[PDB]
């Protein structure tokens, strides 16, 4: 029984941008009201309650490469 | 029994942009009201309740390459 | 029984940006009201309650490479 | 020539209210854009340009009596 | 020539209110943009340009009586 | 020529209020942008440009009586 996992990646995720700019994130204020009575969160729970969040994200590049490799033998 | 996993990737995800700009994210304020009584969230639960979120995302490039590799032997 | 995990990565996640700038994160103030009565959070719980958060994130590059490798033998 | 201006007012503008309340003025944000080039406003001009105004007016009483009296002799 | 201006006012503008309350003025943020080039405002001009105004006015009484008296002889 | 200006005012502008309260002025932030080039305002000009104003006005009484008297002889 012979298993040979030889993946090969010579790829290139690339970007060229000239001027990147003149960006205005100016939201008028938000209004939020949250009320939570009885919360029984027992096993592997991810919760968010009442977020009011402003983000500006201006990466010059911002290129993402996600690889996963899974060899499972049974 | 002979297994040979030899994938080959010479690909290129690419972008050229000139000027990138003059971008105005200006939303008028939101109004949100949330009420949650009895929440029994037991196993592997992802929850969001009451989000009020402004995002500006201006990547110069923003090119994404997702690869997955799964070799499963039984 | 012979297993050979030889992955090869010569990839390049790359960016070129010229001028990166003139970025204005100026949100008008948010209004948030949170009330939580009875919260029984027992095992592996991640919670957020009442966030009101302004972020500006201007990486010059901001290129992300995520690789995972899992060899599981049974 | 005999002029006799004898007006008589014994009137009563009246109100009774019990509980006055539980009033919620919660408008989502407005969006307004105004541009005015050449405005030659010379004599007795009242102008408003670009109003974006929220009012809540809860008088307990709020009863108005307007009287005018004009005697003009020529 | 005989002129007799004898106005008589025994009026009563009145209010009774019990509890006055539980009033919530909570508008989400407004967005306003104003641009005015050439404004030649010469004689008795009242102007407003670009107002963004929140008012809450809760008078316990708030009863108004306006009287005007004008005797003009020529 | 005989002129007799005898106005008589025994009026009463009145209010009774019980409890006055539980009043919440909580507006989310406003966003305002004003630009004014060439403004030639010569004679008796009242101007406002770019107001962003929050008012709470809770008079216990707040009753207004305005009287004007004008005798003009020519």
Residue numbers in the entry:
A (entry chain E), B (entry chain F), C (entry chain C), D (entry chain B), E (entry chain A), F (entry chain D): 306 to 379
Reproduce the article's own wording on this structure.
Dominantly inherited mutations in MAPT, the microtubule-associated protein tau gene, give rise to cases of FTD and parkinsonism linked to chromosome 17. Here, we used cryo-electron microscopy to determine the structures of tau filaments from the brains of human MAPT mutants V337M and R406W. Both amino acid substitutions gave rise to tau filaments with the Alzheimer fold, which consisted of paired helical filaments in all V337M and R406W cases and of straight filaments in two V337M cases. V337 lies inside the ordered core of the Alzheimer fold, whereas R406 lies outside it.
We performed in vitro assembly reactions with recombinant proteins to determine whether the V337M substitution in tau (297–391) influences the rate of filament assembly when compared to wild-type tau (297–391). With V337M tau (297–391), thioflavin T (ThT) fluorescence started to increase after 90 min and reached a plateau at 180 min. With wild-type tau (297–391), ThT fluorescence began to rise after 200 min and plateaued at 300 min. We then proceeded to determine the cryo-EM structures of recombinant V337M tau (297–391) filaments, which revealed the presence of a majority of PHFs and a substantial number of quadruple helical filaments (QHFs). The cryo-EM density at residue 337 is consistent with a methionine residue, demonstrating that this residue at position 337 can give rise to PHFs. It remains to be seen whether the formation of QHFs contributed to this effect. These findings suggest that substitution V337M has a direct effect on tau filament assembly and demonstrate the usefulness of V337M tau (297–391) for increasing filament formation in experimental studies.
